[PDB]
């Protein structure tokens, strides 16, 4: 079989030769009991850079020793890309949401041999699901592989925005001291009201991490959490997002993007936020009207905005979120720490082993089959 | 009476005329039950910049309307400085640990009228306690006023070092994307081993905040915490610092500075650390040998270092911790957020009211009174 694997570029200084640490913490399961991936074997050392082109998700030696071909590329966009040319006879397509190889209906139509569309990561927004089903393409993901990674990123950003960490660090880096300049925009997080717009795997993990900071926790969702969880975390539930915003000092968005949520944060709804509110958004960039957020930070409606998701993605060099006041942006990276990469590289191998050996892929990995 | 109050400078663009928010969250007590300050009144709006010279800790109207004198200055060092000149007849001296007016034995000797040395903040590191005892000077602090503020700072820095936040943010700020450059030094915190070198008010608050990140918690201290605390946080106890280091992915220092802890982190003890360990230090800069930390980050013995305390302080412009690899430094600010300032400005007034009215100052505020009776 032919495996076509799209990954992002190596570091500018080249694929790393050394790493900061020698191993990764051992984890038995995810919250709720799902076990971590169980491939028969791995050809990588957990902690290596696996999601760049030279990392190959540690797949080459398993595939080639079993008679398969592996084509790795970062050239994924447009009809002229390496991905599009190799797609026509690829049996398996693999990519990460952090550098996604889109499986449009047009591409699925030309992918005459396509049997498996594998997300090395979470989700399937880059895959046209009905076209995949109609063509008997299996679509699978490494469920839960980086939900905790994103939640850590969220809480880190909440703390950094509220305490004015990033300008403070710049004063130190540039040789200043400037105590009053650091803290004239700096507060404690303690006893603030924090709300999450969804409470799935990420949102729940965020709520649990926020609780011992003694904040007042709010959330909105379609499904209320179990009453025992609301009670142990002292949660206030809101039926609508609009009912939650006016009471929150901090709002974190952990909800999927669809037309009814596209630009749900705009000039009109920002009017509902407390003056000086903070927003953290690691879900999707298009949840926020780009220029409305920037306008809210210029006026002081918001006291900070941070996240790792942008529209468009990758963000152009001139994207205004890069330089607007009191931003805590990073590039799209939260779920591709070396820790998360080890999990979803192992999960990718587990799925491939099942697929090639004719054994069932985990139910929780399957999206459509 | 004459009150001499040393504060840090206003922002370079001037004292702020607006603030990012309109009020502060309400908090009833500190962990363990100590109530927040209870002055009879305050002449400031909580959230204002109170620890700079123009903020005056909100004290001027209260002191002057009661016949007192108030001198506020940031000019605190040297024989011609405002502080040294006004010290000779001051009844009360107030300063913050973030810009401390040192009360050495020599200065206390020259302060002919000194009756009260008030820390607008926590501690008394800048005050010679024996001189205060010998001269019957009361020494007081606004206990607990920013212990939580520092703990937040610590966990924020732990997350930022582990996940490589600060270089990642700059790739974004500078117009890049560079996913692999961001994450080739980036990990999750989950299930790492984190140890604190003391577990007092700050260290315990750090442990509680770290627990739901599903890390493995370690600590050492002079005495063990109550078993009920160890169990609820699943703590591993270590009798010595040296026994704790080799097992920790992250070590946070929350211990006071004394001769036995000076340079406790050095080229020799760093050999005990896991390769790629992270250190966060909001206690005092001289706990860590300056160049040993820088050497450990160049070699990879440490994968990151962050904190807000430096040696010396203020850090000179060329201080190597400012630019060494994988640092998360800030200036000395963790316990002077606007939130903490409201608490210790209120606490400062409460103590002053008691002192001038001849009412007892809270036992928990007292460091010295006649003798070292906290």
Curated annotation (Swiss-Prot), chain B:
Spell out the CDD domains in the cross-references.
FDH (cd05302)
Is Acetylation a UniProt keyword of this protein? no
GO MF assignments:
formate dehydrogenase (NAD+) activity; NAD binding; oxidoreductase activity, acting on the CH-OH group of donors, NAD or NADP as acceptor
Q: Which organism is it from?
A: Pseudomonas sp. (strain 101) (Achromobacter parvulus T1)
Ranked from the top, the taxonomy reads: Bacteria, Pseudomonadati, Pseudomonadota
Question: Which transformation does this protein catalyse, written as a reaction?
Answer: formate + NAD(+) = CO2 + NADH
Per the record, where is site Important for catalytic activity? 284, 332
Q: What is this protein called?
A: Formate dehydrogenase
Record's keyword terms, sorted? Cytoplasm, NAD, Oxidoreductase
* Location in or out of the cell: Cytoplasm
Tell me which Gene Ontology terms the entry assigns under biological process.
formate catabolic process
Q: How does it assemble?
A: Homodimer.
Q: Where does substrate bind?
A: 122, 146
Q: What are the binding positions for NAD(+) in this chain?
A: 147, 201-202, 221, 256-260, 282, 308, 332-335
Query: What role is this protein assigned?
Result: Catalyzes the NAD(+)-dependent oxidation of formate to carbon dioxide. Formate oxidation is the final step in the methanol oxidation pathway in methylotrophic microorganisms. Has a role in the detoxification of exogenous formate in non-methylotrophic organisms.
Look up the EC number in the record and give it.
1.17.1.9
- Please give one Pfam family short name: 2-Hacid_dh_C
* Cysteine pairs bridged by disulfides in the record: none
Report the sequence similarity comment from the record.
Belongs to the D-isomer specific 2-hydroxyacid dehydrogenase family. FDH subfamily.
Q: Name one GO cellular component term.
A: cytoplasm
């Amino acid at each position: 079989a032919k495996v076509l694997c799209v990954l992002y570029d190596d570091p500018v200084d080249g694929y790393p030769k050394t790493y900061a640490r020698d191993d990764l913490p051992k984890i038995d399961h995810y919250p709720g009991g799902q076990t971590l991936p169980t491939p028969k074997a791995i050809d990588f050392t957990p902690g290596q850079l696996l999601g760049s082109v030279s990392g190959e998700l540690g797949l080459r030696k398993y595939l080639e020793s079993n008679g398969h071909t592996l084509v790795v590329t970062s050239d994924k966009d447009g009809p002229d890309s390496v991905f599009e040319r190799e797609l026509v006879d690829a049996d398996v397509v693999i990519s990460q949401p952090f550098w996604p190889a889109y499986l449009t209906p047009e591409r699925i139509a030309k992918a005459k041999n396509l049997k498996l569309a594998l997300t090395a990561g979470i989700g399937s927004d880059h895959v046209d699901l009905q076209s995949a089903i109609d063509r008997n393409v299996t679509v699978a993901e490494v469920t839960y592989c980086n939900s905790i990674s994103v939640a850590e990123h969220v809480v880190m950003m909440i703390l950094s925005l509220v305490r004015n960490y990033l300008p403070s660090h710049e004063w130190a880096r540039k040789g200043g001291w400037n105590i009053a300049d650091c803290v004239s925009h700096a507060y404690d997080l303690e006893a603030m009201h924090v709300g999450t717009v969804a409470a799935g795997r990420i949102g729940l993990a965020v709520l649990r991490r926020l609780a011992p900071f003694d904040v007042h926790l709010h959330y909105t969702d379609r499904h209320r959490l179990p009453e025992s969880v609301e009670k142990e975390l002292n949660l206030t539930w809101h039926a609508t997002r609009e009912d939650m915003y006016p009471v929150c000092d901090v709002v974190t968005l952990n909800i999927p993007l669809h037309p009814p949520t596209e630009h749900m944060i705009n000039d009109e709804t920002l009017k509902l936020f407390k003056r000086g509110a903070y927003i953290v958004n690691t879900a999707r960039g298009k949840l926020c009207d780009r220029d409305a957020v920037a306008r809210a930070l210029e006026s002081g409606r918001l006291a900070g905005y941070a996240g790792d998701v942008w529209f468009p993605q990758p963000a152009p060099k001139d994207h205004p979120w890069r330089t607007m006041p009191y931003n805590g942006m990073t590039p799209h990276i939260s779920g591709t720490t070396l820790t998360a990469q080890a999990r979803y590289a192992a999960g990718t191998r587990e799925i491939l082993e099942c697929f090639f050996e004719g054994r069932p892929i985990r139910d929780e990995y399957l999206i459509v089959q």
